[PDB]
Amino acid sequence: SEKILFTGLDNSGKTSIIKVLQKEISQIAMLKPTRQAQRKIFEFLGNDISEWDLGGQEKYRIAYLKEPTKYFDRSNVCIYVIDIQDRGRMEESISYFSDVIKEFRKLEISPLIYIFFHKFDPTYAKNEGIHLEGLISQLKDEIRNIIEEEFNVSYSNTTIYDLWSIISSFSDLLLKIFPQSELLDKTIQEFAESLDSNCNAILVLDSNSLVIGQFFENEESKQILTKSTPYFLTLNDSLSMIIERGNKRFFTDQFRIKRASEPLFLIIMTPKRGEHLLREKIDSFITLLQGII
Amino acid sequence: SEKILFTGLDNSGKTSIIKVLQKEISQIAMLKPTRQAQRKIFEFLGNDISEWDLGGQEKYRIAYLKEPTKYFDRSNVCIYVIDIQDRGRMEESISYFSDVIKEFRKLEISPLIYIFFHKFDPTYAKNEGIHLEGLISQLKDEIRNIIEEEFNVSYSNTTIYDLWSIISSFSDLLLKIFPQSELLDKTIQEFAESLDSNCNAILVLDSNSLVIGQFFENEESKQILTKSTPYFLTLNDSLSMIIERGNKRFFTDQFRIKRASEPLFLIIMTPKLREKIDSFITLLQGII
Amino acid sequence: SEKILFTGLDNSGKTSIIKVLQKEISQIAMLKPTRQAQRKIFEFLGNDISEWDLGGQEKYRIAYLKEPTKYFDRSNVCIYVIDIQDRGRMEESISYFSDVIKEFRKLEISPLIYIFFHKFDPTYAKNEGIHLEGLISQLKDEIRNIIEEEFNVSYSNTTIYDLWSIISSFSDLLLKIFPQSELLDKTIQEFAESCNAILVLDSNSLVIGQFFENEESKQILTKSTPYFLTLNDSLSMIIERGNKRFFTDQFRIKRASEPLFLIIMTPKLREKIDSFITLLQGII
Amino acid sequence: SEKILFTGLDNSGKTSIIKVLQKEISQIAMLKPTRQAQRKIFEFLGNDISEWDLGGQEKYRIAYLKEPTKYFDRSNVCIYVIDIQDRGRMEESISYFSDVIKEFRKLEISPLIYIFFHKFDPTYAKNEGIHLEGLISQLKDEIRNIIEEEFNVSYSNTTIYDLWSIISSFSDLLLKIFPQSELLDKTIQEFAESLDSNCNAILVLDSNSLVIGQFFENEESKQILTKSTPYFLTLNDSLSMIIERGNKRFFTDQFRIKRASEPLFLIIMTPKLREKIDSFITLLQGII
Amino acid sequence: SEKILFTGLDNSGKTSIIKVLQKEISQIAMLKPTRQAQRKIFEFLGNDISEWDLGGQEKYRIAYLKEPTKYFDRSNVCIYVIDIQDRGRMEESISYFSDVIKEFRKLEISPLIYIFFHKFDPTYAKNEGIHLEGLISQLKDEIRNIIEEEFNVSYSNTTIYDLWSIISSFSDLLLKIFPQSELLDKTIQEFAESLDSNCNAILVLDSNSLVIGQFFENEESKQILTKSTPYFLTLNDSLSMIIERGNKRFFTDQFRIKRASEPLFLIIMTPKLREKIDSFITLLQGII
Ligand SMILES: Nc1nc2c(ncn2[C@@H]2O[C@H](COP(=O)(O)OP(=O)(O)OP(=O)(O)O)[C@@H](O)[C@H]2O)c(=O)[nH]1
Ligand SMILES: Nc1nc2c(ncn2[C@@H]2O[C@H](COP(=O)(O)OP(=O)(O)OP(=O)(O)O)[C@@H](O)[C@H]2O)c(=O)[nH]1
Ligand SMILES: Nc1nc2c(ncn2[C@@H]2O[C@H](COP(=O)(O)OP(=O)(O)OP(=O)(O)O)[C@@H](O)[C@H]2O)c(=O)[nH]1
Ligand SMILES: Nc1nc2c(ncn2[C@@H]2O[C@H](COP(=O)(O)OP(=O)(O)OP(=O)(O)O)[C@@H](O)[C@H]2O)c(=O)[nH]1
Ligand SMILES: Nc1nc2c(ncn2[C@@H]2O[C@H](COP(=O)(O)OP(=O)(O)OP(=O)(O)O)[C@@H](O)[C@H]2O)c(=O)[nH]1
Ligand SMILES: [Mg+2]
Ligand SMILES: [Mg+2]
Ligand SMILES: [Mg+2]
Ligand SMILES: [Mg+2]
Ligand SMILES: [Mg+2]
């Protein structure tokens, strides 16, 4: 299987990120500090994945460093969550990150390192401007000096007030473990162009609502589709569909692949003024996706 | 202002019904016994209505009867909620119903009485069958002997597992307080027939999602629209729309009327013209 | 009957504050933008109080200013909520505050104005420090220029991450509407002298009386009382945890429907508590 | 590792039971039908245990039986949940239970079979009485004819309206996977007797609030401590202790054992000595 | 021989009903709780019948269910008596009834079940109204669910304040064991119409004063004769007769049938011929 480890200081936001990934946002208010490690198992495209949420209180971080084989071993990815709104605890956070990397070195493993600069809220980021960007740049410099190019590192700005920032970062991480064929993007890109200027955006999602494939004509089309899709997903699950809302038309479809348990979800967005997508075009597209993914 | 009173024994389901009406079903798992009377104010078509939820524990029921002018006076509608799954407490429920009716008599007021035979769940109703039907018929006989034709009494079977049963019963109650013109049903019927064989069902809702007008070509069209509308409303609120799914097409629209604060909601289901809709809405704005 | 009006821009936090007051914190994650005016009624010491939660989205603010008599009239207290983390919307917030004050002037009423500097979170205040205090000073100066000594104005810092900040501020507001006798504080002050802390709460868990020997005792009792309440309501009592001892009691007053709650924290006498309760029942 | 499997028909209540075990009762109102298998990992006295929640809708049960090695294999316990309020689906429930037992036989494994007669609510049980008792007796006969003494079977009446019904059954189930020494029951018994007539009830809980040991002088002392302890825990967790309410006094304590990660919880109820509690704790640390 | 079983909870009124049948109403005030089973033998139309009065206190009921073959075996009729004034013991009563039926199932016998809804006093029934009727209808449903159409069940409302209610129910019970020829009712009907409109009511009784045949022109004629007959019997016993009183005339006669030990009693009420009577007696002698 695969092991994904969430770690970081207490209050950094690890459990809230997980609650977003589980579509259980309503449980974020009732969140208490996580006690030791909480573990669950989920499936990504036919592969079972174990997820570890390490409670970040100091009494728990010490226990993690006392029995490192129990917690840090066999990790394929380490998600390290930093509360970028809490400058006063950043030095402490980098210090605990150095301890975690040191444990990986003693175990002689090199998991993918994914840093979530978390609580990067829209309101907070707008009011803080380049002052916040400079702080993140200093954080990366400290992280690079600790990593010393012995680990692969990725960085993402995340916030529970932007579901896409969490979904796409977690999807990008899973697709680094399970790389996709270049044919996938080439097929999606060619399908969009075969519609002749009548395709603003496409998403291919799995049963966890994680992103398997994507296309965006521009930044505005990306914002419209990624912000509307969760509500269309809620509608689909509660009830193929065609939805006209505002100046856009949405085509939604479910399809299965051989190796995965549950169906995948396809959504295509076009201008409302555009021609209706021919069903035979969507079906041939789905047939290729079933052979590529 | 109009006064609507929720009363009945504890555990009968009054607050859960209100939570359904407030679109807050998720809080039903968190419900505690209601402490005495809880009150809110909402608007229905430009009229304010105060809503009283009276906690049903015995210590509160005694307080209600000790100071009747503070709780039962000026009530325009009394909703009496009966847990029809609790046979063992029905005699106590009817007994307390007699007390409430007596206080109305002493105050010399005649509010509309609306019985909610509540917790009429689909699974429960299917397993209990004619026994539950006979048990409800016996409850009605006891209520009739208490009322003695001195009050207008309506009945409905309700359950939180059927949102339509609660929404349409409460809408029916409010439309008895505020009667509609006969032109409304005629306009909805005439608009439906003007679509040839291409109009299965219509719903006109207010901002509380209460039913102001309705049309159903048959029972199957009624089931499809009433079960699907709550999810379209959640989508519309979370974001004019058109939704095609299966063999049906759904048109949703919002329009305002002069006397009401928030817009109304129109949804039309057809098998799979903006002018017909715009002209329909214009007629509704002059009638509703 | 008294009318309390919650207003301010959308996203400022008004409904979350109300949810804390209703002991419904678990619903804050499920909150959506409030549509128009949501109204409820509750009792405070035998008095009925109507509470108005005005949705702050611009389309609703335009409707409030189009029909001022329907929303702002007969207001006894206006609670104006400002997201002090959102400097980018502060000019917009002060401008709408000016419009609200103007409607009060045209109605010729003078409600108590209670400003909540909301989202004053412990982490945010720790990191912003003195820069945030200067910002609050600028807001007070603007509000002063708008009020022009025609309204009584009070200020409070609030955050859903400090339940006491919201409970005490709202209690302080209600005690300005319904003033208490000075004998209440003196009776509590003298009972303790006869004690690290004392709270007298009503059935809404609002603060009717309080005593705190020092800042440390205050933090201990204020943070512990909700769970002592949760224990009580869900279930007199005597509790010992740590180096402290707690005494909880319930009693009724003549004009109130539900009982009041008394909790005393001492370092670790029935007759002295019963005489203290007797005096409270004759003063509150 | 150990594997616990929740299965049964859709709507039987499996996920609600798990929500109670996870101290997330507030989320029961938000539950949706479970899609295929949901899996979590928890610790019981130092042992990692995988928990499988198999969604019960028919399209999922067909998938389970198509690939029985992926779902039923290596199971230590099978919890089969039956909605005993839904007589109309009991024949369907027993038939799927027989299919599950058949898959265990083809795998040549013998998990403990634990039947939960769920939704045994206080109100429903009181109103149905002996009529429901006879129906449960008929269910046991069908289960026994399916088992044919090839499996170990346990039965429990459960309901989300009685938290102890679910906690104690799940605790009883875990203690059969990990049998305890007879010294634990004797030690708890002797300590309660060393207090003379000053010990009404004792509970020893783990960090999951599952029951490791228990003592009850009589049925009334059992109902007082079990219904009070969740609020004594929520107090302690959200915040040693002594509490006096009514005619009772309570002592709470936390202690750790060598092989477990988180502390255990001890609570003693007496009618209204620190050295005696410490020595009793020291004994438990060498026995558990 | 035939076996009739009187059973039911203590205080239900079993022994009081038997005292009415034995013409010993004066002993009702001296009744104590019956200790275990009391047994008598009486003759009905040439057939010996054993009558078991089972004491209903719980310690006796437990003794019955411990040795079911001694008490319940070979029963031809089980009379179950329910005090319908005591709602607080109806669950206990229905539960014990379920136990008795379970013993008949294990014995693989199917006696006639006769339910006496007892203490249906005129004053109590008048004051309780349809509330008592619903309760009896509820009890009837519980009995049906317990029986599952495996037994013949009859019902009657009985009370010691209406001798006819007890006499006619016990008579109807015995005639179900020993069905009569259809020529009997046709003969009584034909004799009545042969007297023109000069025949309001007829009773044919045995030496136990049980009703072998009856005829009533209307309800008033039934109430007059059924209420006057007990005193006519006492006069006849204490001493053929003719009695004129008010606007009615009563003819009484005694006759024997070949298979019965003691004479039968014929009473005819007419508005105010020996030969007609003698021939009517002759037909009855060969039909009964
Ligand atoms: N503004 C903002 N707040 C957030 C965000 N994410 C989480 N929070 C809040 O931050 C607090 C910390 O959340 P948690 O998820 O419990 O943090 P944690 O890392 O799991 O803490 P531990 O359980 O001790 O490990 C919670 O009150 C969240 O509501 C975010 O993206 N933006
Ligand atoms: N099966 C079923 N249960 C229901 C239904 N409605 C409410 N309940 C449950 O019945 C219980 C009673 O809920 P409440 O709404 O608090 O009852 P109440 O009348 O408000 O009781 P008081 O607050 O004491 O007056 C709750 O546990 C609900 O979940 C229903 O329609 N069907
Ligand atoms: N950090 C922080 N966030 C808060 C606080 N209070 C509320 N929020 C968040 O701010 C957002 C706005 O909350 P609301 O209470 O709905 O704001 P509102 O004033 O009611 O907005 P309208 O309904 O449009 O009038 C929500 O996401 C809350 O979670 C707080 O004290 N601190
Ligand atoms: N009255 C009563 N209702 C219950 C009880 N437990 C669960 N329910 C209700 O039963 C319904 C089914 O609950 P679930 O837990 O989702 O059932 P499930 O077995 O998980 O169904 P699937 O996800 O399809 O497998 C929900 O509406 C619950 O509220 C109970 O103990 N008593
Ligand atoms: N009002 C009223 N009381 C009755 C009636 N029949 C019996 N009772 C009273 O009910 C009480 C019970 O009478 P029993 O005949 O001794 O009852 P039982 O079933 O024989 O009791 P056990 O001997 O213990 O089995 C007596 O006090 C009677 O006076 C009736 O028809 N109406
Ligand atoms: Mg956490
Ligand atoms: Mg309630
Ligand atoms: Mg709001
Ligand atoms: Mg489920
Ligand atoms: Mg007797």
JSON list of N, CA and C in Angstrom, two decimals, chain E residues 9 82-95 132 135 139:
[
{"chain": "E", "resi": 9, "resn": "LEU", "atom": "N", "xyz": [-55.14, -12.77, 34.98]},
{"chain": "E", "resi": 9, "resn": "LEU", "atom": "CA", "xyz": [-54.46, -12.20, 36.13]},
{"chain": "E", "resi": 9, "resn": "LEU", "atom": "C", "xyz": [-55.34, -12.27, 37.38]},
{"chain": "E", "resi": 82, "resn": "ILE", "atom": "N", "xyz": [-60.06, -10.54, 31.41]},
{"chain": "E", "resi": 82, "resn": "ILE", "atom": "CA", "xyz": [-59.28, -9.30, 31.46]},
{"chain": "E", "resi": 82, "resn": "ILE", "atom": "C", "xyz": [-60.12, -8.24, 32.15]},
{"chain": "E", "resi": 83, "resn": "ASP", "atom": "N", "xyz": [-59.55, -7.62, 33.18]},
{"chain": "E", "resi": 83, "resn": "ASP", "atom": "CA", "xyz": [-60.16, -6.46, 33.83]},
{"chain": "E", "resi": 83, "resn": "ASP", "atom": "C", "xyz": [-59.89, -5.25, 32.94]},
{"chain": "E", "resi": 84, "resn": "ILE", "atom": "N", "xyz": [-60.90, -4.82, 32.18]},
{"chain": "E", "resi": 84, "resn": "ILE", "atom": "CA", "xyz": [-60.71, -3.70, 31.26]},
{"chain": "E", "resi": 84, "resn": "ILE", "atom": "C", "xyz": [-60.79, -2.36, 31.96]},
{"chain": "E", "resi": 85, "resn": "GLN", "atom": "N", "xyz": [-61.01, -2.34, 33.28]},
{"chain": "E", "resi": 85, "resn": "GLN", "atom": "CA", "xyz": [-60.89, -1.10, 34.05]},
{"chain": "E", "resi": 85, "resn": "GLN", "atom": "C", "xyz": [-59.46, -0.83, 34.50]},
{"chain": "E", "resi": 86, "resn": "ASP", "atom": "N", "xyz": [-58.59, -1.84, 34.45]},
{"chain": "E", "resi": 86, "resn": "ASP", "atom": "CA", "xyz": [-57.23, -1.74, 34.99]},
{"chain": "E", "resi": 86, "resn": "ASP", "atom": "C", "xyz": [-56.25, -1.68, 33.82]},
{"chain": "E", "resi": 87, "resn": "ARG", "atom": "N", "xyz": [-56.09, -0.47, 33.27]},
{"chain": "E", "resi": 87, "resn": "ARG", "atom": "CA", "xyz": [-55.16, -0.28, 32.16]},
{"chain": "E", "resi": 87, "resn": "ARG", "atom": "C", "xyz": [-53.72, -0.55, 32.57]},
{"chain": "E", "resi": 88, "resn": "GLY", "atom": "N", "xyz": [-53.37, -0.25, 33.82]},
{"chain": "E", "resi": 88, "resn": "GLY", "atom": "CA", "xyz": [-52.01, -0.40, 34.30]},
{"chain": "E", "resi": 88, "resn": "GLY", "atom": "C", "xyz": [-51.52, -1.83, 34.40]},
{"chain": "E", "resi": 89, "resn": "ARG", "atom": "N", "xyz": [-52.41, -2.81, 34.28]},
{"chain": "E", "resi": 89, "resn": "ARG", "atom": "CA", "xyz": [-52.02, -4.21, 34.31]},
{"chain": "E", "resi": 89, "resn": "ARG", "atom": "C", "xyz": [-52.34, -4.94, 33.01]},
{"chain": "E", "resi": 90, "resn": "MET", "atom": "N", "xyz": [-52.67, -4.21, 31.94]},
{"chain": "E", "resi": 90, "resn": "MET", "atom": "CA", "xyz": [-53.03, -4.86, 30.69]},
{"chain": "E", "resi": 90, "resn": "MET", "atom": "C", "xyz": [-51.82, -5.44, 29.98]},
{"chain": "E", "resi": 91, "resn": "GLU", "atom": "N", "xyz": [-50.67, -4.77, 30.07]},
{"chain": "E", "resi": 91, "resn": "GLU", "atom": "CA", "xyz": [-49.44, -5.34, 29.51]},
{"chain": "E", "resi": 91, "resn": "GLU", "atom": "C", "xyz": [-49.10, -6.65, 30.21]},
{"chain": "E", "resi": 92, "resn": "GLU", "atom": "N", "xyz": [-49.19, -6.66, 31.54]},
{"chain": "E", "resi": 92, "resn": "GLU", "atom": "CA", "xyz": [-48.98, -7.89, 32.29]},
{"chain": "E", "resi": 92, "resn": "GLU", "atom": "C", "xyz": [-50.01, -8.95, 31.90]},
{"chain": "E", "resi": 93, "resn": "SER", "atom": "N", "xyz": [-51.24, -8.54, 31.61]},
{"chain": "E", "resi": 93, "resn": "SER", "atom": "CA", "xyz": [-52.29, -9.49, 31.24]},
{"chain": "E", "resi": 93, "resn": "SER", "atom": "C", "xyz": [-52.04, -10.06, 29.85]},
{"chain": "E", "resi": 94, "resn": "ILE", "atom": "N", "xyz": [-51.75, -9.20, 28.87]},
{"chain": "E", "resi": 94, "resn": "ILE", "atom": "CA", "xyz": [-51.47, -9.68, 27.52]},
{"chain": "E", "resi": 94, "resn": "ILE", "atom": "C", "xyz": [-50.23, -10.56, 27.51]},
{"chain": "E", "resi": 95, "resn": "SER", "atom": "N", "xyz": [-49.22, -10.20, 28.32]},
{"chain": "E", "resi": 95, "resn": "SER", "atom": "CA", "xyz": [-48.01, -11.00, 28.38]},
{"chain": "E", "resi": 95, "resn": "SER", "atom": "C", "xyz": [-48.29, -12.39, 28.93]},
{"chain": "E", "resi": 132, "resn": "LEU", "atom": "N", "xyz": [-62.93, 3.68, 26.11]},
{"chain": "E", "resi": 132, "resn": "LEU", "atom": "CA", "xyz": [-62.86, 2.27, 26.46]},
{"chain": "E", "resi": 132, "resn": "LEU", "atom": "C", "xyz": [-62.98, 1.39, 25.22]},
{"chain": "E", "resi": 135, "resn": "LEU", "atom": "N", "xyz": [-59.69, 1.10, 23.53]},
{"chain": "E", "resi": 135, "resn": "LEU", "atom": "CA", "xyz": [-58.79, 0.25, 24.31]},
{"chain": "E", "resi": 135, "resn": "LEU", "atom": "C", "xyz": [-59.10, -1.23, 24.09]},
{"chain": "E", "resi": 139, "resn": "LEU", "atom": "N", "xyz": [-56.78, -4.11, 22.46]},
{"chain": "E", "resi": 139, "resn": "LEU", "atom": "CA", "xyz": [-56.55, -5.43, 23.04]},
{"chain": "E", "resi": 139, "resn": "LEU", "atom": "C", "xyz": [-56.90, -6.54, 22.06]}
]
